[PDB]
Structures are given as structure tokens and as C-alpha cells.
Amino acid sequence: RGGAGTSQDGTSKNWFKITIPYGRKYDKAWLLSMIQSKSSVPFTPIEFHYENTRAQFFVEDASTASALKAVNYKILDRENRRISIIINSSAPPHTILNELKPEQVEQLKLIMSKRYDGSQQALDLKGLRSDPDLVAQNIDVVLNRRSSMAATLRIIEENIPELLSLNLSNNRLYRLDDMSSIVQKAPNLKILNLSGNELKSERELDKIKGLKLEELWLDGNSLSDTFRDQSTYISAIRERFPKLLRLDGHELPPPIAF
């Protein structure tokens, strides 16, 4: 019965992840022998596995896991470097789990660099699906999904803290919640896009609102056939993005102070 880790969640279970930076540079048998010979207590590798250049295994007993953190910088390999143990709390064996793992990310950062420009900050991050490089690479970075879009923005934040544009059309993407943060990450972002995408309810622009968009786009989206004339469009849209100046490529009449 219930005492310290039952099949009924919210128990004294608690799962972890050991991830060893630069593991696959050693014998799955050696490395695991040492990360023991120095461990206060014995343990039990749960679903060990490599990933690019790392090795990472889960644990259960919160006590076990934590006695490995003391194995940190203890083992000392061939070339004479120090093994490094990164211990982190987490979900059980490959729980549902979504997102992109460290590699792909530090890999996505590349498509962008070769995409973002410093002449005009034009991060023509357009149609990423149908795109070479990542093309053929299991690289299913789908910006519509919070996950990608997430990192996708973390990089803009982390590397480009002055972006002035962000062509992002066509990328079959609907809910605009996820990229809600951009307002903080992409301040100077003046222009933007969402063109030929998939946005029915203009009520989305309400989310990404905070962008003083001295220019925008928004056609191709269902958001089209759901309005009166090009006037209800402008008049609506124009709200969230007042100082708006251009749109979908056509001329947009002057502002209107008071």
C-alpha cells in the first residue's frame, strides 16, 4: 500500500534525469562503473541512453539521484579531464514529453542566422517547413506548435535583442497564444507578418498586440472572408496596432490623431 511511491500520482515517487555532458566519449560500461565507485550509495540505471554526445539516465529514489550530484567532477578520465554530472528533477521514463532537445535547438539557431539579416534585421524566417538544410533531417520544427515557436523566440531574444522585422507567413499556424512573449523578446520589432498563414479569428492580434507595428501583413488567413469591406478590416485591425502604416501590400490611408 501507499508508503513511498505508488502508481497513484502525487506520491513519494519523484523522478529524475542524470544527463552526463560528454558521455558518449566513454564505455557505457566504464562510465557507469565509475559513476558508482564514487557514489555514496549503489543505484540502478533507468533507461540509459545516449543522445549525440551525451548519456543520460533516470532515477527514482530522491536519495539515490542526489548522491550522484556528489559524483560531480569526481571521476577523472583518460586525456585527464573531469567527468561532469548534471542532475535534474523530472518526469518518469520518457513521459509523453514534447519540445526540441538541446541539439536541434543549437541547430535551429543556424537556419535563422543564415536567415536573419543585419542590414535591416529582416528575419525572413518564412516558410520553415518547406525549407532545405533542415529539409531531410527529421527536423520537424513546426512553428505553429508552442514548443518550436518557443525556442524559436528564445533564440531571437537570446541573440537578436533588436529585431526589426519578422517575416513568418505561410507557416500553417493557428493559435497565436504561444508567441505571446515576443512583445518582450522582440521590442524594436517594428514590422511583422503572419501572412498566408491560418488565422481565422482576428481576435488573435489581441494576443501579440503589444507590438508598435509601423507596418504589418495578414492576408491569406481565414481572417479574410469574415469581414465587410477592406474598411472593416483596416478599421478593426488598426485598433490593436494604431500607428499602423501599411498592410498586406496595398496603400493604407494616413493616421488620425485628435
PDB file of C-alpha atoms in Angstrom:
ATOM      1  CA  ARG A   1       0.000   0.000   0.000  1.00  0.00           C
ATOM      2  CA  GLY A   2       0.867   3.718  -0.248  1.00  0.00           C
ATOM      3  CA  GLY A   3       4.123   4.423   1.565  1.00  0.00           C
ATOM      4  CA  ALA A   4       6.783   5.932  -0.733  1.00  0.00           C
ATOM      5  CA  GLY A   5       5.860   5.890  -4.439  1.00  0.00           C
ATOM      6  CA  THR A   6       2.554   4.383  -5.622  1.00  0.00           C
ATOM      7  CA  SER A   7       1.011   4.089  -9.101  1.00  0.00           C
ATOM      8  CA  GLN A   8      -1.271   6.835  -7.820  1.00  0.00           C
ATOM      9  CA  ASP A   9       0.392  10.192  -8.610  1.00  0.00           C
ATOM     10  CA  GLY A  10       1.396  12.776  -6.021  1.00  0.00           C
ATOM     11  CA  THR A  11       3.359  10.146  -4.078  1.00  0.00           C
ATOM     12  CA  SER A  12       6.898   9.846  -2.639  1.00  0.00           C
ATOM     13  CA  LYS A  13       7.859   8.781  -6.190  1.00  0.00           C
ATOM     14  CA  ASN A  14       9.609  11.769  -7.813  1.00  0.00           C
ATOM     15  CA  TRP A  15      11.575  11.043 -10.987  1.00  0.00           C
ATOM     16  CA  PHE A  16      14.944  12.413 -12.123  1.00  0.00           C
ATOM     17  CA  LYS A  17      17.355  12.742 -15.056  1.00  0.00           C
ATOM     18  CA  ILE A  18      21.127  12.342 -14.810  1.00  0.00           C
ATOM     19  CA  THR A  19      22.353  13.577 -18.210  1.00  0.00           C
ATOM     20  CA  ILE A  20      26.161  13.397 -18.429  1.00  0.00           C
ATOM     21  CA  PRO A  21      27.715  16.115 -20.564  1.00  0.00           C
ATOM     22  CA  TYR A  22      30.130  14.440 -22.970  1.00  0.00           C
ATOM     23  CA  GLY A  23      29.222  10.855 -22.078  1.00  0.00           C
ATOM     24  CA  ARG A  24      29.396   9.096 -25.454  1.00  0.00           C
ATOM     25  CA  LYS A  25      33.099   9.569 -25.221  1.00  0.00           C
ATOM     26  CA  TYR A  26      33.261   6.652 -22.840  1.00  0.00           C
ATOM     27  CA  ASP A  27      32.355   2.977 -22.422  1.00  0.00           C
ATOM     28  CA  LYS A  28      28.695   2.599 -21.492  1.00  0.00           C
ATOM     29  CA  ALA A  29      30.240   0.064 -19.134  1.00  0.00           C
ATOM     30  CA  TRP A  30      33.195   2.089 -17.799  1.00  0.00           C
ATOM     31  CA  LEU A  31      31.494   5.401 -17.241  1.00  0.00           C
ATOM     32  CA  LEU A  32      28.663   3.652 -15.436  1.00  0.00           C
ATOM     33  CA  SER A  33      31.167   1.711 -13.311  1.00  0.00           C
ATOM     34  CA  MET A  34      32.781   4.897 -12.039  1.00  0.00           C
ATOM     35  CA  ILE A  35      29.581   6.883 -11.540  1.00  0.00           C
ATOM     36  CA  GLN A  36      29.169   4.196  -8.881  1.00  0.00           C
ATOM     37  CA  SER A  37      32.615   3.508  -7.483  1.00  0.00           C
ATOM     38  CA  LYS A  38      32.385   7.076  -6.249  1.00  0.00           C
ATOM     39  CA  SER A  39      28.702   7.088  -5.379  1.00  0.00           C
ATOM     40  CA  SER A  40      27.797   7.240  -1.737  1.00  0.00           C
ATOM     41  CA  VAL A  41      25.311   4.529  -2.488  1.00  0.00           C
ATOM     42  CA  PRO A  42      24.528   1.990  -5.260  1.00  0.00           C
ATOM     43  CA  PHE A  43      21.594   2.733  -7.605  1.00  0.00           C
ATOM     44  CA  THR A  44      20.006   1.434 -10.876  1.00  0.00           C
ATOM     45  CA  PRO A  45      20.227   2.965 -14.395  1.00  0.00           C
ATOM     46  CA  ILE A  46      16.634   3.514 -15.626  1.00  0.00           C
ATOM     47  CA  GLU A  47      16.507   3.590 -19.394  1.00  0.00           C
ATOM     48  CA  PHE A  48      20.116   4.704 -20.006  1.00  0.00           C
ATOM     49  CA  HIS A  49      20.659   6.036 -23.489  1.00  0.00           C
ATOM     50  CA  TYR A  50      22.966   8.231 -25.464  1.00  0.00           C
ATOM     51  CA  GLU A  51      21.987  11.323 -27.390  1.00  0.00           C
ATOM     52  CA  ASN A  52      24.534  12.837 -29.706  1.00  0.00           C
ATOM     53  CA  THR A  53      27.420  13.377 -27.262  1.00  0.00           C
ATOM     54  CA  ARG A  54      25.599  12.850 -24.016  1.00  0.00           C
ATOM     55  CA  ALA A  55      24.460   9.965 -21.886  1.00  0.00           C
ATOM     56  CA  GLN A  56      21.523  10.340 -19.567  1.00  0.00           C
ATOM     57  CA  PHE A  57      19.618   8.013 -17.226  1.00  0.00           C
ATOM     58  CA  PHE A  58      16.665   8.476 -14.865  1.00  0.00           C
ATOM     59  CA  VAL A  59      16.495   7.527 -11.199  1.00  0.00           C
ATOM     60  CA  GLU A  60      13.677   7.168  -8.693  1.00  0.00           C
ATOM     61  CA  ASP A  61      14.680   7.446  -5.050  1.00  0.00           C
ATOM     62  CA  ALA A  62      15.251  11.170  -4.447  1.00  0.00           C
ATOM     63  CA  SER A  63      18.041   9.967  -2.170  1.00  0.00           C
ATOM     64  CA  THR A  64      19.794   7.917  -4.875  1.00  0.00           C
ATOM     65  CA  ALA A  65      19.725  10.617  -7.529  1.00  0.00           C
ATOM     66  CA  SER A  66      21.208  13.214  -5.127  1.00  0.00           C
ATOM     67  CA  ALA A  67      24.162  11.060  -4.140  1.00  0.00           C
ATOM     68  CA  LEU A  68      25.282  11.251  -7.771  1.00  0.00           C
ATOM     69  CA  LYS A  69      25.422  15.031  -7.679  1.00  0.00           C
ATOM     70  CA  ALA A  70      28.283  14.412  -5.306  1.00  0.00           C
ATOM     71  CA  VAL A  71      29.899  12.296  -8.016  1.00  0.00           C
ATOM     72  CA  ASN A  72      30.096  15.575  -9.912  1.00  0.00           C
ATOM     73  CA  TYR A  73      33.608  16.472 -11.066  1.00  0.00           C
ATOM     74  CA  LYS A  74      34.864  13.330  -9.222  1.00  0.00           C
ATOM     75  CA  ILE A  75      35.573  10.756 -11.962  1.00  0.00           C
ATOM     76  CA  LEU A  76      38.718  11.536 -13.938  1.00  0.00           C
ATOM     77  CA  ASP A  77      39.168  10.175 -17.494  1.00  0.00           C
ATOM     78  CA  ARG A  78      41.966   9.352 -19.916  1.00  0.00           C
ATOM     79  CA  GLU A  79      43.038  12.628 -21.574  1.00  0.00           C
ATOM     80  CA  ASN A  80      42.841  13.847 -17.950  1.00  0.00           C
ATOM     81  CA  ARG A  81      39.576  15.767 -17.995  1.00  0.00           C
ATOM     82  CA  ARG A  82      36.809  15.579 -15.349  1.00  0.00           C
ATOM     83  CA  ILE A  83      33.533  13.789 -15.939  1.00  0.00           C
ATOM     84  CA  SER A  84      30.612  16.138 -15.321  1.00  0.00           C
ATOM     85  CA  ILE A  85      27.292  15.121 -13.825  1.00  0.00           C
ATOM     86  CA  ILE A  86      24.244  17.319 -14.323  1.00  0.00           C
ATOM     87  CA  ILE A  87      21.441  16.119 -12.112  1.00  0.00           C
ATOM     88  CA  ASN A  88      17.915  17.373 -12.654  1.00  0.00           C
ATOM     89  CA  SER A  89      14.461  16.585 -11.293  1.00  0.00           C
ATOM     90  CA  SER A  90      11.779  15.430 -13.732  1.00  0.00           C
ATOM     91  CA  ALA A  91       9.074  13.273 -15.258  1.00  0.00           C
ATOM     92  CA  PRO A  92       9.121   9.472 -15.270  1.00  0.00           C
ATOM     93  CA  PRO A  93      10.520   7.323 -18.140  1.00  0.00           C
ATOM     94  CA  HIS A  94      10.153   9.324 -21.364  1.00  0.00           C
ATOM     95  CA  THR A  95       6.812  10.742 -20.164  1.00  0.00           C
ATOM     96  CA  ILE A  96       4.632  11.910 -23.076  1.00  0.00           C
ATOM     97  CA  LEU A  97       7.227  14.710 -23.454  1.00  0.00           C
ATOM     98  CA  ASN A  98       7.218  17.261 -26.256  1.00  0.00           C
ATOM     99  CA  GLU A  99       9.678  20.019 -27.304  1.00  0.00           C
ATOM    100  CA  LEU A 100      13.078  20.026 -29.022  1.00  0.00           C
ATOM    101  CA  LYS A 101      16.164  18.688 -27.235  1.00  0.00           C
ATOM    102  CA  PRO A 102      19.386  20.830 -26.864  1.00  0.00           C
ATOM    103  CA  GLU A 103      20.884  19.695 -30.188  1.00  0.00           C
ATOM    104  CA  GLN A 104      18.170  20.665 -32.708  1.00  0.00           C
ATOM    105  CA  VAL A 105      17.773  23.928 -30.823  1.00  0.00           C
ATOM    106  CA  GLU A 106      21.506  24.791 -31.026  1.00  0.00           C
ATOM    107  CA  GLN A 107      20.906  23.671 -34.578  1.00  0.00           C
ATOM    108  CA  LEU A 108      17.778  25.734 -35.295  1.00  0.00           C
ATOM    109  CA  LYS A 109      19.787  28.739 -34.245  1.00  0.00           C
ATOM    110  CA  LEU A 110      21.602  28.151 -37.538  1.00  0.00           C
ATOM    111  CA  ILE A 111      18.748  28.278 -40.047  1.00  0.00           C
ATOM    112  CA  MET A 112      17.883  31.586 -38.510  1.00  0.00           C
ATOM    113  CA  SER A 113      21.386  33.115 -38.573  1.00  0.00           C
ATOM    114  CA  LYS A 114      21.538  32.295 -42.273  1.00  0.00           C
ATOM    115  CA  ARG A 115      18.069  33.822 -42.383  1.00  0.00           C
ATOM    116  CA  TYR A 116      18.199  36.866 -40.125  1.00  0.00           C
ATOM    117  CA  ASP A 117      19.799  39.873 -41.683  1.00  0.00           C
ATOM    118  CA  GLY A 118      21.641  42.730 -40.011  1.00  0.00           C
ATOM    119  CA  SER A 119      21.176  45.095 -42.901  1.00  0.00           C
ATOM    120  CA  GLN A 120      17.558  45.577 -41.854  1.00  0.00           C
ATOM    121  CA  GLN A 121      17.029  42.951 -39.150  1.00  0.00           C
ATOM    122  CA  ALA A 122      14.787  41.235 -41.670  1.00  0.00           C
ATOM    123  CA  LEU A 123      14.471  37.806 -40.077  1.00  0.00           C
ATOM    124  CA  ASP A 124      12.791  36.369 -43.224  1.00  0.00           C
ATOM    125  CA  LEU A 125      12.039  33.304 -41.115  1.00  0.00           C
ATOM    126  CA  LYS A 126       9.416  32.462 -43.784  1.00  0.00           C
ATOM    127  CA  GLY A 127       8.113  29.005 -44.734  1.00  0.00           C
ATOM    128  CA  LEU A 128      10.324  26.905 -42.454  1.00  0.00           C
ATOM    129  CA  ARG A 129       8.525  23.656 -43.266  1.00  0.00           C
ATOM    130  CA  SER A 130       9.325  23.514 -46.956  1.00  0.00           C
ATOM    131  CA  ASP A 131      12.944  24.555 -46.377  1.00  0.00           C
ATOM    132  CA  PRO A 132      16.310  22.974 -47.376  1.00  0.00           C
ATOM    133  CA  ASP A 133      19.020  22.355 -44.757  1.00  0.00           C
ATOM    134  CA  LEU A 134      16.524  21.154 -42.101  1.00  0.00           C
ATOM    135  CA  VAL A 135      14.834  19.501 -45.068  1.00  0.00           C
ATOM    136  CA  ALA A 136      15.513  15.792 -44.699  1.00  0.00           C
ATOM    137  CA  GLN A 137      16.746  15.712 -41.102  1.00  0.00           C
ATOM    138  CA  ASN A 138      13.754  14.568 -39.018  1.00  0.00           C
ATOM    139  CA  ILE A 139      13.844  18.286 -38.261  1.00  0.00           C
ATOM    140  CA  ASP A 140      10.085  18.752 -37.912  1.00  0.00           C
ATOM    141  CA  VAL A 141      10.284  22.170 -36.299  1.00  0.00           C
ATOM    142  CA  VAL A 142       6.647  23.250 -36.544  1.00  0.00           C
ATOM    143  CA  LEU A 143       6.340  26.898 -35.537  1.00  0.00           C
ATOM    144  CA  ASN A 144       2.586  26.564 -35.111  1.00  0.00           C
ATOM    145  CA  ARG A 145       3.276  24.500 -32.005  1.00  0.00           C
ATOM    146  CA  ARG A 146       4.234  26.420 -28.868  1.00  0.00           C
ATOM    147  CA  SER A 147       7.308  24.186 -28.439  1.00  0.00           C
ATOM    148  CA  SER A 148       9.219  25.216 -31.547  1.00  0.00           C
ATOM    149  CA  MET A 149       7.878  28.770 -31.613  1.00  0.00           C
ATOM    150  CA  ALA A 150       9.039  28.793 -28.062  1.00  0.00           C
ATOM    151  CA  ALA A 151      12.741  28.102 -28.657  1.00  0.00           C
ATOM    152  CA  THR A 152      12.295  29.919 -31.954  1.00  0.00           C
ATOM    153  CA  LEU A 153      11.670  33.002 -29.885  1.00  0.00           C
ATOM    154  CA  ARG A 154      14.177  32.251 -27.161  1.00  0.00           C
ATOM    155  CA  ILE A 155      16.907  32.498 -29.848  1.00  0.00           C
ATOM    156  CA  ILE A 156      15.603  35.777 -31.178  1.00  0.00           C
ATOM    157  CA  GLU A 157      15.628  37.026 -27.582  1.00  0.00           C
ATOM    158  CA  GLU A 158      18.971  35.461 -26.675  1.00  0.00           C
ATOM    159  CA  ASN A 159      20.826  36.528 -29.839  1.00  0.00           C
ATOM    160  CA  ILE A 160      18.771  39.241 -31.538  1.00  0.00           C
ATOM    161  CA  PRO A 161      17.654  41.752 -28.928  1.00  0.00           C
ATOM    162  CA  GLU A 162      16.800  44.418 -31.517  1.00  0.00           C
ATOM    163  CA  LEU A 163      14.949  42.521 -34.263  1.00  0.00           C
ATOM    164  CA  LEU A 164      13.130  44.986 -36.514  1.00  0.00           C
ATOM    165  CA  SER A 165      11.049  42.616 -38.647  1.00  0.00           C
ATOM    166  CA  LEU A 166       9.901  39.009 -38.651  1.00  0.00           C
ATOM    167  CA  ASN A 167       8.520  37.565 -41.889  1.00  0.00           C
ATOM    168  CA  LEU A 168       6.649  34.494 -40.614  1.00  0.00           C
ATOM    169  CA  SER A 169       3.981  33.937 -43.257  1.00  0.00           C
ATOM    170  CA  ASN A 170       2.643  30.634 -44.681  1.00  0.00           C
ATOM    171  CA  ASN A 171       3.694  28.534 -41.665  1.00  0.00           C
ATOM    172  CA  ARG A 172       0.328  26.793 -41.147  1.00  0.00           C
ATOM    173  CA  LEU A 173      -0.120  28.146 -37.625  1.00  0.00           C
ATOM    174  CA  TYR A 174      -3.352  28.904 -35.788  1.00  0.00           C
ATOM    175  CA  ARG A 175      -3.480  29.802 -32.088  1.00  0.00           C
ATOM    176  CA  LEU A 176      -1.268  32.854 -31.517  1.00  0.00           C
ATOM    177  CA  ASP A 177      -1.035  32.450 -27.776  1.00  0.00           C
ATOM    178  CA  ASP A 178       2.417  30.778 -27.646  1.00  0.00           C
ATOM    179  CA  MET A 179       4.264  33.671 -29.348  1.00  0.00           C
ATOM    180  CA  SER A 180       2.719  35.996 -26.777  1.00  0.00           C
ATOM    181  CA  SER A 181       6.093  36.740 -25.262  1.00  0.00           C
ATOM    182  CA  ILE A 182       7.645  38.226 -28.421  1.00  0.00           C
ATOM    183  CA  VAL A 183       6.387  41.567 -27.198  1.00  0.00           C
ATOM    184  CA  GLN A 184       9.173  41.456 -24.646  1.00  0.00           C
ATOM    185  CA  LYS A 185      11.734  39.471 -26.663  1.00  0.00           C
ATOM    186  CA  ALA A 186      11.367  41.401 -29.885  1.00  0.00           C
ATOM    187  CA  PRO A 187      10.901  45.044 -28.695  1.00  0.00           C
ATOM    188  CA  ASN A 188      12.196  47.044 -31.700  1.00  0.00           C
ATOM    189  CA  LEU A 189      10.322  44.609 -33.918  1.00  0.00           C
ATOM    190  CA  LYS A 190       8.528  47.270 -35.948  1.00  0.00           C
ATOM    191  CA  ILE A 191       7.224  45.257 -38.868  1.00  0.00           C
ATOM    192  CA  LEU A 192       5.826  41.708 -38.714  1.00  0.00           C
ATOM    193  CA  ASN A 193       3.906  39.253 -40.755  1.00  0.00           C
ATOM    194  CA  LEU A 194       1.541  36.302 -40.316  1.00  0.00           C
ATOM    195  CA  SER A 195       0.559  36.248 -43.976  1.00  0.00           C
ATOM    196  CA  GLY A 196      -0.803  33.310 -45.929  1.00  0.00           C
ATOM    197  CA  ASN A 197      -0.992  31.511 -42.612  1.00  0.00           C
ATOM    198  CA  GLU A 198      -4.026  30.093 -40.847  1.00  0.00           C
ATOM    199  CA  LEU A 199      -5.692  32.645 -38.580  1.00  0.00           C
ATOM    200  CA  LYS A 200      -9.491  32.837 -38.734  1.00  0.00           C
ATOM    201  CA  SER A 201     -10.420  34.978 -35.710  1.00  0.00           C
ATOM    202  CA  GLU A 202      -8.770  38.356 -35.955  1.00  0.00           C
ATOM    203  CA  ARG A 203      -9.253  38.178 -32.209  1.00  0.00           C
ATOM    204  CA  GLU A 204      -5.744  36.728 -32.206  1.00  0.00           C
ATOM    205  CA  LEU A 205      -3.991  40.016 -32.957  1.00  0.00           C
ATOM    206  CA  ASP A 206      -5.251  40.791 -29.500  1.00  0.00           C
ATOM    207  CA  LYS A 207      -2.578  38.451 -28.113  1.00  0.00           C
ATOM    208  CA  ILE A 208       0.534  39.627 -29.973  1.00  0.00           C
ATOM    209  CA  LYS A 209      -0.891  43.164 -29.552  1.00  0.00           C
ATOM    210  CA  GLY A 210       1.981  44.878 -27.750  1.00  0.00           C
ATOM    211  CA  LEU A 211       3.898  45.447 -30.970  1.00  0.00           C
ATOM    212  CA  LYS A 212       4.124  49.060 -32.107  1.00  0.00           C
ATOM    213  CA  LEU A 213       3.922  47.746 -35.682  1.00  0.00           C
ATOM    214  CA  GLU A 214       4.985  50.541 -38.026  1.00  0.00           C
ATOM    215  CA  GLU A 215       3.869  48.025 -40.727  1.00  0.00           C
ATOM    216  CA  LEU A 216       2.137  44.629 -40.877  1.00  0.00           C
ATOM    217  CA  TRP A 217       0.543  41.937 -43.028  1.00  0.00           C
ATOM    218  CA  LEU A 218      -2.320  39.456 -42.508  1.00  0.00           C
ATOM    219  CA  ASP A 219      -3.893  38.129 -45.718  1.00  0.00           C
ATOM    220  CA  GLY A 220      -4.150  34.504 -46.802  1.00  0.00           C
ATOM    221  CA  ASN A 221      -5.697  33.838 -43.397  1.00  0.00           C
ATOM    222  CA  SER A 222      -9.349  32.848 -42.910  1.00  0.00           C
ATOM    223  CA  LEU A 223      -9.369  36.165 -41.093  1.00  0.00           C
ATOM    224  CA  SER A 224     -10.181  37.428 -44.593  1.00  0.00           C
ATOM    225  CA  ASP A 225     -13.612  36.184 -45.522  1.00  0.00           C
ATOM    226  CA  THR A 226     -15.113  37.209 -42.162  1.00  0.00           C
ATOM    227  CA  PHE A 227     -15.274  40.971 -42.701  1.00  0.00           C
ATOM    228  CA  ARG A 228     -17.325  43.539 -44.658  1.00  0.00           C
ATOM    229  CA  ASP A 229     -15.042  45.581 -46.930  1.00  0.00           C
ATOM    230  CA  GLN A 230     -11.367  46.490 -46.778  1.00  0.00           C
ATOM    231  CA  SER A 231     -12.629  49.184 -44.383  1.00  0.00           C
ATOM    232  CA  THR A 232     -13.964  46.956 -41.625  1.00  0.00           C
ATOM    233  CA  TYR A 233     -10.633  45.142 -41.978  1.00  0.00           C
ATOM    234  CA  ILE A 234      -8.403  48.173 -41.543  1.00  0.00           C
ATOM    235  CA  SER A 235     -10.784  49.711 -39.025  1.00  0.00           C
ATOM    236  CA  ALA A 236     -10.763  46.526 -36.950  1.00  0.00           C
ATOM    237  CA  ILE A 237      -7.074  45.543 -37.269  1.00  0.00           C
ATOM    238  CA  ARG A 238      -5.956  49.165 -36.955  1.00  0.00           C
ATOM    239  CA  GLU A 239      -7.238  49.130 -33.376  1.00  0.00           C
ATOM    240  CA  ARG A 240      -4.750  46.759 -31.799  1.00  0.00           C
ATOM    241  CA  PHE A 241      -1.957  48.241 -33.974  1.00  0.00           C
ATOM    242  CA  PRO A 242      -2.823  52.007 -34.088  1.00  0.00           C
ATOM    243  CA  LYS A 243       0.207  53.704 -35.595  1.00  0.00           C
ATOM    244  CA  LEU A 244      -0.069  51.073 -38.318  1.00  0.00           C
ATOM    245  CA  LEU A 245       1.100  52.388 -41.702  1.00  0.00           C
ATOM    246  CA  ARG A 246       0.985  49.728 -44.426  1.00  0.00           C
ATOM    247  CA  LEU A 247      -0.816  46.402 -44.919  1.00  0.00           C
ATOM    248  CA  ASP A 248      -0.901  43.188 -46.984  1.00  0.00           C
ATOM    249  CA  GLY A 249       0.982  45.148 -49.636  1.00  0.00           C
ATOM    250  CA  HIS A 250      -1.608  47.818 -50.501  1.00  0.00           C
ATOM    251  CA  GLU A 251      -1.593  51.525 -49.535  1.00  0.00           C
ATOM    252  CA  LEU A 252      -3.057  52.287 -46.114  1.00  0.00           C
ATOM    253  CA  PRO A 253      -4.511  55.805 -45.726  1.00  0.00           C
ATOM    254  CA  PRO A 254      -2.917  58.200 -43.159  1.00  0.00           C
ATOM    255  CA  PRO A 255      -3.172  58.065 -39.364  1.00  0.00           C
ATOM    256  CA  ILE A 256      -5.777  60.020 -37.357  1.00  0.00           C
ATOM    257  CA  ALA A 257      -4.793  61.755 -34.125  1.00  0.00           C
ATOM    258  CA  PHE A 258      -7.047  64.332 -32.402  1.00  0.00           C
TER     259      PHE A 258
END
